[PDB]
Structures are given as C-alpha cells and as structure tokens.
Design an enzyme around this catalytic site. Sequence first.
Site, PDB file in Angstrom:
ATOM      1  N   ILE A   1       0.309  13.016  -9.536  1.00  0.00           N
ATOM      2  CA  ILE A   1       0.571  14.058  -8.545  1.00  0.00           C
ATOM      3  C   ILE A   1       0.396  13.506  -7.136  1.00  0.00           C
ATOM      4  CG2 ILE A   1      -0.139  16.360  -7.628  1.00  0.00           C
ATOM      5  CD1 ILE A   1       1.263  16.336 -10.520  1.00  0.00           C
TER       6      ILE A   1
ATOM      7  N   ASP B   1      -9.636   0.612   1.221  1.00  0.00           N
ATOM      8  CA  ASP B   1      -9.656   2.067   1.372  1.00  0.00           C
ATOM      9  C   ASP B   1     -10.865   2.486   2.214  1.00  0.00           C
ATOM     10  OD1 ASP B   1      -7.427   2.473  -0.538  1.00  0.00           O
ATOM     11  OD2 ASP B   1      -8.901   2.139  -2.093  1.00  0.00           O
TER      12      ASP B   1
ATOM     13  N   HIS C   1       5.745  -3.502  -2.322  1.00  0.00           N
ATOM     14  CA  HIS C   1       5.611  -4.955  -2.361  1.00  0.00           C
ATOM     15  C   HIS C   1       6.895  -5.685  -1.950  1.00  0.00           C
ATOM     16  CE1 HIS C   1       1.661  -5.840  -4.596  1.00  0.00           C
ATOM     17  NE2 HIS C   1       1.617  -4.564  -4.254  1.00  0.00           N
TER      18      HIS C   1
ATOM     19  N   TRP D   1      -7.397   6.373  -8.203  1.00  0.00           N
ATOM     20  CA  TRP D   1      -8.090   6.848  -7.015  1.00  0.00           C
ATOM     21  C   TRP D   1      -8.343   8.347  -7.081  1.00  0.00           C
ATOM     22  CZ3 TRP D   1      -4.668   2.888  -7.111  1.00  0.00           C
ATOM     23  CH2 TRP D   1      -4.997   1.732  -6.398  1.00  0.00           C
ATOM     24  N   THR D   2      -7.546   9.072  -7.853  1.00  0.00           N
ATOM     25  CA  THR D   2      -7.592  10.525  -7.897  1.00  0.00           C
ATOM     26  C   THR D   2      -7.685  11.049  -9.337  1.00  0.00           C
ATOM     27  OG1 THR D   2      -5.178  10.830  -7.937  1.00  0.00           O
ATOM     28  CG2 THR D   2      -6.210  10.608  -5.744  1.00  0.00           C
TER      29      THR D   2
ATOM     30  N   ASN E   1      -5.698  13.228 -10.457  1.00  0.00           N
ATOM     31  CA  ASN E   1      -4.317  13.565 -10.778  1.00  0.00           C
ATOM     32  C   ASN E   1      -3.386  12.434 -10.359  1.00  0.00           C
ATOM     33  OD1 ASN E   1      -4.673  16.500 -11.657  1.00  0.00           O
ATOM     34  ND2 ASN E   1      -5.685  16.473  -9.652  1.00  0.00           N
TER      35      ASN E   1
ATOM     36  N   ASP F   1      -0.354  14.115  -3.579  1.00  0.00           N
ATOM     37  CA  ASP F   1      -0.969  15.091  -2.688  1.00  0.00           C
ATOM     38  C   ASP F   1      -1.973  14.382  -1.784  1.00  0.00           C
ATOM     39  OD1 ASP F   1      -3.250  14.622  -4.192  1.00  0.00           O
ATOM     40  OD2 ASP F   1      -3.327  16.651  -5.037  1.00  0.00           O
TER      41      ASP F   1
ATOM     42  N   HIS G   1      -1.909   5.575  -2.572  1.00  0.00           N
ATOM     43  CA  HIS G   1      -2.897   5.456  -3.661  1.00  0.00           C
ATOM     44  C   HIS G   1      -3.255   6.797  -4.279  1.00  0.00           C
ATOM     45  CE1 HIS G   1      -4.173   1.206  -2.207  1.00  0.00           C
ATOM     46  NE2 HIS G   1      -3.040   1.214  -2.889  1.00  0.00           N
ATOM     47  N   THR G   2      -2.724   7.877  -3.725  1.00  0.00           N
ATOM     48  CA  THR G   2      -2.851   9.174  -4.339  1.00  0.00           C
ATOM     49  C   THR G   2      -2.159   9.252  -5.706  1.00  0.00           C
ATOM     50  OG1 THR G   2      -3.032  11.509  -3.743  1.00  0.00           O
ATOM     51  CG2 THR G   2      -0.845  10.407  -3.397  1.00  0.00           C
TER      52      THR G   2
ATOM     53  N   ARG H   1       4.716   1.067  -6.017  1.00  0.00           N
ATOM     54  CA  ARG H   1       4.187  -0.247  -5.745  1.00  0.00           C
ATOM     55  C   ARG H   1       5.279  -1.330  -5.652  1.00  0.00           C
ATOM     56  NH1 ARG H   1       1.369  -4.137  -9.813  1.00  0.00           N
ATOM     57  NH2 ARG H   1       0.680  -5.736  -8.328  1.00  0.00           N
TER      58      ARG H   1
HETATM   59  C1  HEM Z   1      -3.469  -0.711   2.673  1.00  0.00           C
HETATM   60  C2  HEM Z   1      -3.485  -1.888   2.027  1.00  0.00           C
HETATM   61  C3  HEM Z   1      -3.314  -1.894   0.494  1.00  0.00           C
HETATM   62  C4  HEM Z   1      -4.048  -2.587  -0.388  1.00  0.00           C
HETATM   63  C5  HEM Z   1      -5.203  -3.548  -0.084  1.00  0.00           C
HETATM   64  C6  HEM Z   1      -3.574  -2.291  -1.716  1.00  0.00           C
HETATM   65  C7  HEM Z   1      -4.071  -2.778  -2.903  1.00  0.00           C
HETATM   66  C8  HEM Z   1      -3.723  -2.277  -4.132  1.00  0.00           C
HETATM   67  C9  HEM Z   1      -4.292  -2.769  -5.374  1.00  0.00           C
HETATM   68  C10 HEM Z   1      -5.362  -3.884  -5.461  1.00  0.00           C
HETATM   69  C11 HEM Z   1      -3.747  -2.069  -6.371  1.00  0.00           C
HETATM   70  C12 HEM Z   1      -3.999  -2.222  -7.887  1.00  0.00           C
HETATM   71  C13 HEM Z   1      -2.928  -3.066  -8.599  1.00  0.00           C
HETATM   72  C14 HEM Z   1      -3.287  -3.121 -10.073  1.00  0.00           C
HETATM   73  O1  HEM Z   1      -4.379  -3.659 -10.454  1.00  0.00           O
HETATM   74  O2  HEM Z   1      -2.530  -2.547 -10.878  1.00  0.00           O
HETATM   75  C15 HEM Z   1      -2.791  -1.151  -5.795  1.00  0.00           C
HETATM   76  C16 HEM Z   1      -2.067  -0.257  -6.515  1.00  0.00           C
HETATM   77  C17 HEM Z   1      -1.158   0.623  -6.004  1.00  0.00           C
HETATM   78  N1  HEM Z   1      -0.723   0.644  -4.692  1.00  0.00           N
HETATM   79 FE1  HEM Z   1      -1.688  -0.319  -3.139  1.00  0.00          FE
HETATM   80  N2  HEM Z   1      -2.557  -1.387  -1.594  1.00  0.00           N
HETATM   81  C18 HEM Z   1      -2.354  -1.116  -0.259  1.00  0.00           C
HETATM   82  C19 HEM Z   1      -1.361  -0.299   0.226  1.00  0.00           C
HETATM   83  C20 HEM Z   1      -0.462   0.414  -0.514  1.00  0.00           C
HETATM   84  C21 HEM Z   1       0.703   1.064   0.052  1.00  0.00           C
HETATM   85  C22 HEM Z   1       1.096   1.015   1.552  1.00  0.00           C
HETATM   86  C23 HEM Z   1       1.334   1.705  -0.943  1.00  0.00           C
HETATM   87  C24 HEM Z   1       2.624   2.561  -0.926  1.00  0.00           C
HETATM   88  C25 HEM Z   1       2.917   3.401   0.082  1.00  0.00           C
HETATM   89  C26 HEM Z   1       0.582   1.444  -2.157  1.00  0.00           C
HETATM   90  C27 HEM Z   1       0.895   1.931  -3.396  1.00  0.00           C
HETATM   91  C28 HEM Z   1       0.216   1.650  -4.549  1.00  0.00           C
HETATM   92  C29 HEM Z   1       0.401   2.365  -5.778  1.00  0.00           C
HETATM   93  C30 HEM Z   1       1.292   3.569  -6.089  1.00  0.00           C
HETATM   94  C31 HEM Z   1      -0.522   1.680  -6.739  1.00  0.00           C
HETATM   95  C32 HEM Z   1      -0.715   2.064  -8.213  1.00  0.00           C
HETATM   96  C33 HEM Z   1       0.076   1.118  -9.118  1.00  0.00           C
HETATM   97  C34 HEM Z   1       0.019   1.560 -10.561  1.00  0.00           C
HETATM   98  O3  HEM Z   1      -0.396   2.706 -10.872  1.00  0.00           O
HETATM   99  O4  HEM Z   1       0.473   0.737 -11.401  1.00  0.00           O
HETATM  100  N3  HEM Z   1      -0.509   0.630  -1.893  1.00  0.00           N
HETATM  101  N4  HEM Z   1      -2.792  -1.269  -4.410  1.00  0.00           N
HETATM  102  N1  LIG Z   2      -0.343  -1.655  -3.350  1.00  0.00           N
HETATM  103  N2  LIG Z   2       0.034  -2.406  -2.248  1.00  0.00           N
HETATM  104  C1  LIG Z   2       1.254  -2.193  -1.784  1.00  0.00           C
HETATM  105  O1  LIG Z   2       2.045  -1.480  -2.378  1.00  0.00           O
HETATM  106  C2  LIG Z   2       1.638  -2.835  -0.496  1.00  0.00           C
HETATM  107  C3  LIG Z   2       0.881  -2.651   0.656  1.00  0.00           C
HETATM  108  C4  LIG Z   2       1.295  -3.269   1.835  1.00  0.00           C
HETATM  109  N3  LIG Z   2       2.399  -4.039   1.857  1.00  0.00           N
HETATM  110  C5  LIG Z   2       3.133  -4.229   0.752  1.00  0.00           C
HETATM  111  C6  LIG Z   2       2.770  -3.634  -0.450  1.00  0.00           C
HETATM  112  N1  LIG Z   3      -4.344  -6.702  -2.844  1.00  0.00           N
HETATM  113  N2  LIG Z   3      -4.129  -7.216  -4.129  1.00  0.00           N
HETATM  114  C1  LIG Z   3      -3.114  -6.773  -4.869  1.00  0.00           C
HETATM  115  O1  LIG Z   3      -2.335  -5.934  -4.450  1.00  0.00           O
HETATM  116  C2  LIG Z   3      -2.910  -7.316  -6.255  1.00  0.00           C
HETATM  117  C3  LIG Z   3      -3.383  -8.579  -6.606  1.00  0.00           C
HETATM  118  C4  LIG Z   3      -3.168  -9.049  -7.899  1.00  0.00           C
HETATM  119  N3  LIG Z   3      -2.509  -8.299  -8.799  1.00  0.00           N
HETATM  120  C5  LIG Z   3      -2.051  -7.079  -8.489  1.00  0.00           C
HETATM  121  C6  LIG Z   3      -2.238  -6.557  -7.209  1.00  0.00           C
END
Ligand code: HEM
Ligand SMILES: N=NC(=O)c1ccncc1
Ligand SMILES: N=NC(=O)c1ccncc1
EC number: 1.11.1.11
Length: 249
Positions: free
Chosen positions: A184, A207, A41, A178-179, A181, A186, A162-163, A37
């Site tokens: 992991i 999603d 970001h 989301w999963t 695991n 996958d 999100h896997t 993440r």
């Molecule tokens: C497609 C649009 C996306 C949206 C709307 C989105 C939104 C989010 C949100 C709301 C969370 C939860 C943050 C929290 O409450 O801790 C999250 C977590 C996460 N996102 Fe995304 N995300 C997107 C794309 C991505 C992308 C492109 C990646 C990396 C390739 C990614 C990787 C992750 C990971 C690994 C977490 C878990 C963080 C943790 O376990 O602390 N996301 N995402």
């Molecule tokens: N979880 N959301 C992300 O990791 C992210 C998604 C798209 N662009 C930047 C960061």
């Molecule tokens: N799409 N919203 C987000 O990625 C996010 C918003 C606020 N705090 C953590 C993550």
Amino acid sequence: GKSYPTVSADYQKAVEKAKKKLRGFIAEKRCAPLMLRLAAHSAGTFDKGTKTGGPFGTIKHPAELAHSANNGLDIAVRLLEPLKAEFPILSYADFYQLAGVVAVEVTGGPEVPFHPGREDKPEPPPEGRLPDATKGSDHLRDVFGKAMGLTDQDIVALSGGHTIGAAHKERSGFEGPWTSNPLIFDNSYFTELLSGEKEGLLQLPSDKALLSDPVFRPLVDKYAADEDAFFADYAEAHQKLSELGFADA
Ligand code: HEM
Ligand SMILES: N=NC(=O)c1ccncc1
Ligand SMILES: N=NC(=O)c1ccncc1
Ligand SMILES: N=NC(=O)c1ccncc1
C-alpha cells in the site's frame, strides 16, 4: 526545463496499452515494490556534470545487473521481458520507467506524469553512483543533489518510496518491510520513521538521517501530517527522477 520529443501515434498507442498490461501484471504478481526499485535504480545513476547514466535502458545489461547495488533486479528484468516483447516499438528505457509509474499507481499512490521518448543507450554508467544505506545526509546530498541534480525536498519525498516493499538479507543484507502495509502506497513510511523502531519494521541508517537533518526533518513532519502534501511532492520528485538526462537534464 523539459522539451519532450515527438513520438509517433503508434508509439503512443503502445504506451497506453503497455500501461494497462503493466497494471494487471504488476498487481497479479505482487511485484510493485521491486518494479519501483528497478525504475529508480535505472534512473538514479544520472550524473548531471557529465550527462552520463540515467533512465536509458541500461539496467538490463548484464554488466549493470552485476552491480552489487542491483542485487535482485535481475528478477525484475526477467519478469518484465515477456510483456516487453509484446511492445517491440517501446524502448526498454521507457518501458521500465512506465513500470515504475504503474507500480506507484497500482499500490494506491499518486498518478506520476509520464512522457515517452527515452532512447536505449549502449553503455551502462560506472558502478557506485547509487546511495549507500549505511551513510547519512551529506551522502544523500552528494548522490541526489550533486550527481542527480534533485532538491532536498525531492530526497525526502523519494525516500517515501520505502512505503512499499522490503529489504532482503540475501540482496542488501537488511531485512523486512518499512511499513505494516508493504503493498500500500501511503505516508506510513514517515509515520513509522517518527514513532521509533517498532518490532518487525525496518529503518535504514539513511532513513534515520532524515530525522536529524535541519532541512529534511520539517519535510518528514509535513509528510507524516499531510499525505496529500506527500503525494504531491512525491509525484513531482518521481517525475523528475524518471526524466533525469531526458528531454534536458
Ligand atoms: C534515499 C536513499 C535510498 C537508499 C539508501 C535506499 C536503499 C534501499 C535498500 C538497502 C533497499 C533493500 C534492497 C533489498 O535488500 O531488497 C531498498 C529497497 C527499496 N527501495 Fe530504496 N533506497 C533509497 C531510495 C529509494 C528511492 C528514491 C526509491 C523510489 C522512489 C526507493 C524504492 C525502494 C523500494 C520500493 C524498495 C523495496 C524493494 C522490494 O520490496 O523488493 N528507494 N532501498
Ligand atoms: N532503493 N534505492 C533506489 O531505488 C534508488 C535510490 C536512489 N537512486 C537510485 C535508486
Ligand atoms: N544501498 N544499497 C542497496 O540499495 C543495495 C545493495 C545491495 N543489494 C541490494 C540493494
Ligand atoms: N521479489 N520477487 C518478486 O516480487 C516476484 C518474483 C517472481 N514472481 C513474483 C514476484
């Protein structure tokens, strides 16, 4: 379209040593998802039209960490600072993208190619460029496509990040993995997305938007059926994401 810069032998040795240290650290701390993440970001703020934002070290700045979308990433930055201090020659920009690559690798994901040479830039981008989890396909295309310059295939493959990991009610407000695991890497994100809402698992509106879009849905189906295809497209997209604005974007 990339022309990667030359870095010194010492830079390259640092990274190879940093990659190894990041593997052990990230595996031991159980923080791969948070690191992925952080890397994403860092990168996802790139705007192609103005060539602003992107993976240039700015996420450590208090002003960028203060962005509401970045809630909890201060944890990630703090966790990495002792290790980063062992590699003073590396840019923060490179270090954080390397952390993202390693996060995918050490959870069993594809090996995402990594090229050094990003420079640490002085000014964070304006707030509000990252995707909104409550919005849908039009918004995803605005952010990943119109701003970042990534493809529809990239959007679906990268959503598969999100896997690993989970949302936290004190960070975004959403909650849980989301999963089954979450450490992991996958194709399970797609498998779960398809089967419906299962108790204990999370699906964001962003999603779910993948399931109803004419272009995104065939990709979801492909990745759920073919993990190798997912890994290939994921590695391609992550590399592109990690290199936005770098060495030509
Ligand atoms: C497609 C649009 C996306 C949206 C709307 C989105 C939104 C989010 C949100 C709301 C969370 C939860 C943050 C929290 O409450 O801790 C999250 C977590 C996460 N996102 Fe995304 N995300 C997107 C794309 C991505 C992308 C492109 C990646 C990396 C390739 C990614 C990787 C992750 C990971 C690994 C977490 C878990 C963080 C943790 O376990 O602390 N996301 N995402
Ligand atoms: N979880 N959301 C992300 O990791 C992210 C998604 C798209 N662009 C930047 C960061
Ligand atoms: N799409 N919203 C987000 O990625 C996010 C918003 C606020 N705090 C953590 C993550
Ligand atoms: N969500 N935070 C973490 O992953 C973590 C924070 C501190 N130490 C280990 C792991």
